[PDB]
Amino acid sequence: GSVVIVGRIILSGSGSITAYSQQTRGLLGCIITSLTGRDKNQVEGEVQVVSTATQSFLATCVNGVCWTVYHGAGSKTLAGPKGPITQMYTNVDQDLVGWQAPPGARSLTPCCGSSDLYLVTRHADVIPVRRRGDSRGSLLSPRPVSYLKGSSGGPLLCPSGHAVGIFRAAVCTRGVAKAVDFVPVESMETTMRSPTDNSSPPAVPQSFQVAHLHAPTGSGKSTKVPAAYAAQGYKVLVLNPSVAATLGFGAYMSKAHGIDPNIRTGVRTITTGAPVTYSTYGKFLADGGCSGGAYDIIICDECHSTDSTTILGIGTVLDQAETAGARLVVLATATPPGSVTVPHPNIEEVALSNTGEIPFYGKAIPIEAIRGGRHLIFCHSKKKCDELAAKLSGLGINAVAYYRGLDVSVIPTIGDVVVVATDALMTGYTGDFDSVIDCNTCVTQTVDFSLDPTFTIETTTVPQDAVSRSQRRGRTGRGRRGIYRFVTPGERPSGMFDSSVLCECYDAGCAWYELTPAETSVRLRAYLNTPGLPVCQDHLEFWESVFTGLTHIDAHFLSQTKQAGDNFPYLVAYQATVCARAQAPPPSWDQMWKCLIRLKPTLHGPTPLLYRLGAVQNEVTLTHPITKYIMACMSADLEVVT
Amino acid sequence: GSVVIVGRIILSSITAYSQQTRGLLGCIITSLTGRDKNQVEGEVQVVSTATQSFLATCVNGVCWTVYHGAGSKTLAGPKGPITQMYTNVDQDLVGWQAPPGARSLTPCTCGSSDLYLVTRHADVIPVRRRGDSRGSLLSPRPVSYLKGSSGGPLLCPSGHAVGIFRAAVCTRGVAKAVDFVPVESMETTMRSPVFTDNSSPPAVPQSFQVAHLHAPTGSGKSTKVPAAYAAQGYKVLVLNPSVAATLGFGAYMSKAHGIDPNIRTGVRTITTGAPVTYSTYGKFLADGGCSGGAYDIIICDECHSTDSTTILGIGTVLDQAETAGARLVVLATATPPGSVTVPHPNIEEVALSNTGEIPFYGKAIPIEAIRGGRHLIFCHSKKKCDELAAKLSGLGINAVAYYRGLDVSVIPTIGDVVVVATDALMTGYTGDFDSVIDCNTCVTQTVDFSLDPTFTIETTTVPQDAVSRSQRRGRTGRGRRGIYRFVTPGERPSGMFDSSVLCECYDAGCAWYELTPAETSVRLRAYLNTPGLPVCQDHLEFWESVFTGLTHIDAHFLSQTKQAGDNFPYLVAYQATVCARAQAPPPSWDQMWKCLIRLKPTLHGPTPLLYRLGAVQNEVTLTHPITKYIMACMSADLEVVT
């Protein structure tokens, strides 16, 4: 699935910056060219209209490099004359990707910094921008954000027609684009002028350094590399998203490499005074972060993880580590931002067809593929797991469902099995399988600044990303041969997460780790300011302002939402608090609002709605001080992609 | 563009599972050819256009779905594209003869009131039958869950079809009930004569009847047919959308039929005392509708027209004509709902290529196309009209822009010209042209029940529909050889309009026609309830409820929003009234809020927003009684398509 040129924007050569559009390709041409990776059409112009199957945006040639945004192109190839053109430049952090420009492409030249600027839009509109900083400009006449959509990668031209930068995000005030965020031309020059690798453990530097370990699978990033450090006489801390992983390392490292490491998890903590410690990011945060000179090296393992505890944890490490005398911080992952799933020699990859006795995600699994052996099937949801496991056992298959809220002992270590599991499997359970069958979808949460009155956390099913595919596919072919069976090829890009997750770090700061909103912003900032980690729109000021106003929460409701393990325990207990204090009903009577069930006979009238966390079925009032406070926060500059 | 089976929903206790039988490429290629040599299975099909995805259910050898999804489109099928056997815009229902090897479901006779809705995700929602077309959902669900499920079956416990899903019944974004096309409507449509002759004017009956006149372009439905009737000693009212056409018909009867008719328009009235009157819809409304015993026949010309005035004018006739001693109502149009664009023997139709020195909508116009002769070029906006007219005048073409605002004397009646016009040309100018060049797009208005705090009227560029395309093309080829140049062959289904048009009717009722919202409801209900006219979602109770609360309007602001001639003068002036009375700024200082400028340095604080009519730049307050009122109005059943 390449990126295709489907038209171009032609700029004027004299006087005022004007532009007109030309469409060179229809839908069929596009989808065919996307498949072949082969575009024999002659490139004209500096500004390309580009399309994937799912979205359309712009691209601008500058210094012989055809430039666009990471958030639109991923690490996809460009359809070219001799075939797919690989990306010469992928920079997730600057939101910038670049292809060697093909024959007959022309470049814009870099802008004597004028402050009178001109954004070329995808409908070839030329809108005036006033330069405000290195990467910002204000829209002279503010416009709706819809006006700027699909204009990512468009040029910001100064009056000479020279390029200042390429458009990457709109800055909003309650839905109106008041400014533009761009990728400067200087960032392109830095990208093209930077000298790499990251496959080997970093040597311990003389003074504090953050370093990256992009370890291949089966190279001992969590056992061999911390052991090796400890042999050199270093004190090392290994932080992992998973209790099951953390204990398995402890057990393996006591058994094989000699050291009986200290273990720090909720369920199990042991101090041996050995130079190595395996911890979860959760236990580490519960322990109050970095302690006085205990560690020389901090291995932040699975640093690709975008759950709130890993982001908070890594954030804490980065802000605290140097001051606590660490010499080195390692950000370790097999799958960094921008990385893509490529073939594995121990893994036969087999497209699931419509022939098979088990219907699976519009295609079909044959019974004889899962008749013999131990097999893992990924499903997006609890219901589908409970359904599939029932259908399969009915056909005489030893089918077990695993998902959150269940104990792992359900999965046998021993014999024939089909485990039907959500992504919960992967932090819950350490075992491998003879084949994996992957639905290639997952559940995600997305924020919407919906202004009805405030925001919505929206739950959705999305295409899986490169990190998902590779992690799930990697549950097979470990040391031996395996099969990987799928519904769709191709992934959405890796290394990006929603502003929803930032909200979720504040929620956890507040619910679990006794962090003020201010305290969490310092940690999250450390995470965002560090390059090479997953990336997010900076909504730190926004989210801090929301959580700052949520005061005098009911302790009891919060313990309940915490224990019940659902998303946003703070935000749920907090809405419940406002409801109970007003003797008002919850937004609905979904399982989310169960803390209120005792009170149900006493609760009447419209719910004082703070935000939307699901369907609102009851009538609403927007009069409450806290609704109003959260409505006022919505005035914050919100940088959103377009 | 055919509809394409891309999958199927296999049916069993009622359970369902889905199979995907086609990808995006296959869909595009199949949609282009109309040959789908894939074997049809099941009784529920998953189907697709370029834009939409929905369901089809087979009952009585007929493969049924929604008009709002499928339009008049052929179905890709084994030996090429299957043209639709049934089209019922009023019932929202289309049928194609089921392809061989495709099972039908048997109709449900035993009126069981426990029903089961089948979604496009193969889920089986319990639904309790309420009336003929409605079932209440046993567990209210967000509207988005039901998206893509139009044409899916409502099953009784037998497994027998009750009807097909067509719409969600919403309370503030939550589907609490479903609307469906029942099985009895399918039989009625089936049992109906496939072609009924509406070519010839009907006989005047002894008792009141409403009749349809579907007569070809050229057949004098506004001259020869009123003339013929009057020759029989009948009194005829001919209603037209256009002031220019109304005057023009009176100019032609004087000549070719020896009747000097009465003429009624805003600008000009003539009373000759004749048996024929030509009036505009708006003048007919200004006059106070139907006067008793004034007319025997009312011919509502151009009755496919979905402007607010024509809809209100037609409803007024349907409600008042019988009681005013009329015996016949003729609903007259060349383009009735469901009609498809067809070859015209006078019009050479030629697609624009990318070769040509005049960029136009991504394609190009050769200068040899428009150098010499008199041509009409249709653009969606006046900005595009001005750019193009400026470009062409540079090129040595004698071009002229025409739109709302401009006087039609800009267009020379003689000599070479290129007219660059919006659809405003249609009602303002009567002449024809050597060629028409069409952008195939138009500006429309769309309601969104956005709950931020109330509703939004959104302005959007949409593909044209068969009616528009016809109307635009029909400006060439009149009694001579035309050329018709286009950007795209795409054309949306005809005979449908948006809920904002209903809003527009109440607004015109209150601003212009001295109508209470209850009076507008009577009229719009006559229009809605009459079959064979354009169709709309029934939101009369909702709009009447909002408009009813808009009491004590500032007359000075209203006269101003009227004089200014822009849309929703009543809503605009009413928002202004509240801003002024609460001594607060307008939502912005866009042209729309010009009425407030005399008061600008006295006006401070948040806007009391009632609804959104464009971008809101100022901070907002929800405290106003009127705002709280319109919010209470939003709790009404809103029937929406998903």
Ligand SMILES: Nc1cccc(C(=O)O)c1C(=O)O
């Ligand atoms: N594939 C693995 C499974 C468990 C542990 C490790 C490790 O970090 O040693 C690995 C590996 O990546 O080598």
Ligand SMILES: Nc1cccc(C(=O)O)c1C(=O)O
């Ligand atoms: N194309 C027309 C132009 C003017 C008048 C008439 C008419 O109704 O007589 C027509 C027509 O379509 O017949």
